[PDB]
């Protein structure tokens, strides 16, 4: 459902399977993060389900051994000479060695300034060892980390707990239509996108011959060219698009390794799963309460956060003794308004706006034998309709699906194809809907802050800064103190600086923070883009130095003072709050957990095979499960009759189920409960 879920699904180091250990057999200890994971396996990106600690993911810099034992590159400090030597080792190649601190006052002479450096001893023990004694030093930061984890600025300010949530959610983003690059990200995104294949590349240098939405010809400097045929509205493995938009120019020289098209969630060749939004985490009248979120409705009307959802219904007409299910517009007993957007050849018109229950494909079948009821006999004798002995096993959009129809992919036996023994028509009709967001849709930031939208009101009641500006996004504060996750606020403020720009004044000398704060970080202009390594980033003091010069975007407005906070005026009241209100720029994205997907309703559907009990699933009409652990509270309430209802007729009494149907088709109170089938099936089981 996104380029990441394509990539990071690979580079997965699973613990289960043949030769692997099953979950129940998989005890507590094995789930742990062994010291031997440093650099090998990502210590943070693990599933948070029952596989916490079992399923693992690669690091970034890792390597695959010819044997397949994990290999990680590292420098080796010899006599206090940390060598550029990229020496690959595995775990047992440490116990006769010593790995040192990764970021020390290394003079570039290969020595450590301080003797006592925090190294890892042979057994994995991490302590101080003299400068010249340890033998190995790490390669570099963001070596022990994966890629998806490497897209969280201020990971070092974020709880390892929540970091897990953020990393796993980055795999669940949905393909939007803009994919704004983070104003604040990490330098790995640009690398991590092209490597994902979801970004079209100029495999070979040479001039861009031409640019088009369907292809892009790169005329190589030597005679030949390279024609790139693009992939548009190709449904994803999870019912989404693989849209690959071009960001190139009709003549510009493209290099070996430069973009040809951005993908679903990329821009300028770096990962871009969402949008960059100004914040104020003030709690707004109990509609963003307890993980509920309120947004600026501009973003909805702009569709800044909105997702295209392709889907396919598969319609398979096979060979039968009834005959064959001739998909045409030969519908038994069909009205007029229902054929309006349908083409004669048995499907909808390609580009038919369709809805829930809407008939999509007429997969008409013969019906079979039955006693013609005398009433219907009189009817066909009275008004003059036909027997209509055909069982229309057509497709109607099942519960809660809609949207335009893309088209059809049809294979057929008369087409002389490889269909299996019987299936004479394989059809794949495709329906898309760009689900404009709504409450119940799960959104999330890059630091684990997540949740469904409680509500989104128009821009009218939006507090504004001293720039007269209503803000993008409003969240609840109370999640922040109790989740060690001021890190998203750290990125918030630094993104403010990266959106307004700055000029750290080296008026008389580089400012004290600015000195070991690298060069050209003293300079920045509004609406800019930056990165921050997971452990080696924009330290707290550095950011304090980034607030000093807070040169605005347009007006004369330095809102975040040198220490951090800003002032806001309510957009409802027009009346000021007692204290300054926080603001700044946050990356946000939409998660693939829509309330358009997770609702199931059922008065009465089909029933199980053995028992008369309902079935399970949203696909099948299914039915809800009422467990024993619900029965416990159910009696603790003392509500016996409702429980008899639950297990007797609401599940398993056939005739009563019809009785209650009779009850509330007669407009009468539901009468005395019957005795149910599965109970009698229980008896049969027991007997």
């Amino acid at each position: 459902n996104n380029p990441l879920s394509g990539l990071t699904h690979k580079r997965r180091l699973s613990a289960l399977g043949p030769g692997g250990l099953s979950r129940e057999r998989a005890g507590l200890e094995v789930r742990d993060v062994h010291p031997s994971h440093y650099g090998r396996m990502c210590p943070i990106e693990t599933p948070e389900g029952p596989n916490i600690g079992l399923i693992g993911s690669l690091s970034v810099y890792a390597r695959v051994n010819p044997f397949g034992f994990i290999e990680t590159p590292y420098r080796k400090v010899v006599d206090g000479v940390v060598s550029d030597e990229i020496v690959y080792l595995t775990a047992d190649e440490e116990d006769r060695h010593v790995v040192a601190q990764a970021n020390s006052p290394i003079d570039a002479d290969g020595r450590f300034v301080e003797p006592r450096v925090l190294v890892r001893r042979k057994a994995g023990e991490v302590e101080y060892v003299p400068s010249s004694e340890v033998d190995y030093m790490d390669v570099s930061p963001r070596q022990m980390v994966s890629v998806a984890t490497a897209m969280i600025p201020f990971l070092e300010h974020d709880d390892a707990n929540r970091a897990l949530m953020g990393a796993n959610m980055q795999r669940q983003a949905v393909p939007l239509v803009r994919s704004e690059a983070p104003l604040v990200g990490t330098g790995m995104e640009l690398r991590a996108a092209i490597d994902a294949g979801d970004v079209v590349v100029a495999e070979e240098s040479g001039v861009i011959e031409e640019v088009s939405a369907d292809y892009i010809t790169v005329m190589h400097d030597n005679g030949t060219r390279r024609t790139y045929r693009m992939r548009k509205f190709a449904r994803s493995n999870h019912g989404t698009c693989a849209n690959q938009c071009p960001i190139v120019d009709a003549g510009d020289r493209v290099e070996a390794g430069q973009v040809i098209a951005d993908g679903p969630c990329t821009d300028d060749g770096e990962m871009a799963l969402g949008k960059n939004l100004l914040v104020a985490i003030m709690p707004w009248e109990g509609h963003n309460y307890e993980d509920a979120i309120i947004l600026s409705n501009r973003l909805v009307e702009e569709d800044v956060l909105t997702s295209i959802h392709i889907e396919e219904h598969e319609i398979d007409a096979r060979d039968t003794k009834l005959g064959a299910e001739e998909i045409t517009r030969d519908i038994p007993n069909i009205s007029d308004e229902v054929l309006a957007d349908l083409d004669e050849r048995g499907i909808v018109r390609i580009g038919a706006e369709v809805r829930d229950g809407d008939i999509l494909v007429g997969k008409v079948t013969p019906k079979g034998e039955t006693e013609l009821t005398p009433e219907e006999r009189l009817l066909r004798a009275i008004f003059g309709e036909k027997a209509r002995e055909v069982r229309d096993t057509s497709l109607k959009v099942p519960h809660g699906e809609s949207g335009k129809v893309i088209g059809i992919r049809v294979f057929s036996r008369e087409d002389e194809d490889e269909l299996p023994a019987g299936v004479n028509e394989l059809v794949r009709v495709y329906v898309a809907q760009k689900r404009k967001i709504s409450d119940g849709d799960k959104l999330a930031g890059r630091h684990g802050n997540k949740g469904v939208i409680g509500k989104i009101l128009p821009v009218e009641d939006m507090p504004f800064l001293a720039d007269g500006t209503p803000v993008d996004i409003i969240l609840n504060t109370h999640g922040v103190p109790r989740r060690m996750n001021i890190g998203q606020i750290l990125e918030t403020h630094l993104g403010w600086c990266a959106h307004s720009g700055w000029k750290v004044d080296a008026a008389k000398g580089v400012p004290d923070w600015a000195a070991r704060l690298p060069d050209e970080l003293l300079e920045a202009q509004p609406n800019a883009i930056v990165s921050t390594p997971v452990f080696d980033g924009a330290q707290e003091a550095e950011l304090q130095g980034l607030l000093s010069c807070t040169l605005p975007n347009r007006d004369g407005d330095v809102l975040v003072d040198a220490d951090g906070k800003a002032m806001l005026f309510d957009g409802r009241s027009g009346e000021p709050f007692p204290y300054p209100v926080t603001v700044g720029y946050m990356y946000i994205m939409k998660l693939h957990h829509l309330v358009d997907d997770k609702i199931h309703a059922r008065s009465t559907g089909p029933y199980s095979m053995i028992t008369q009990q309902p079935l399970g699933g949203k696909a099948q009409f299914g039915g809800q499960r009422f467990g024993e652990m619900e029965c416990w509270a159910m009696q603790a309430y003392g509500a016996a009759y409702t429980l008899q209802e639950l297990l007797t007729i609401k599940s398993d009494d056939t005739v009563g189920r019809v009785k209650v149907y009779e009850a509330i088709v007669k407009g009468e109170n539901i009468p005395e409960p019957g005795i149910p089938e599965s109970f009698k099936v229980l008896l049969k089981e027991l007997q």
Binding site: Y61, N103, L190, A256, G257, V259, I529, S531
Partner: peptide, 21 residues
């Protein structure tokens, strides 16, 4: 940087890389 098409994404890096990604 070290990429034929990347934009300038300035950062606060403290050390250089004996090897790339």
């Amino acid at each position: 940087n070290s990429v034929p098409g990347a934009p300038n994404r300035v950062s606060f890096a403290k050390l250089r890389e004996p090897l790339e990604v």
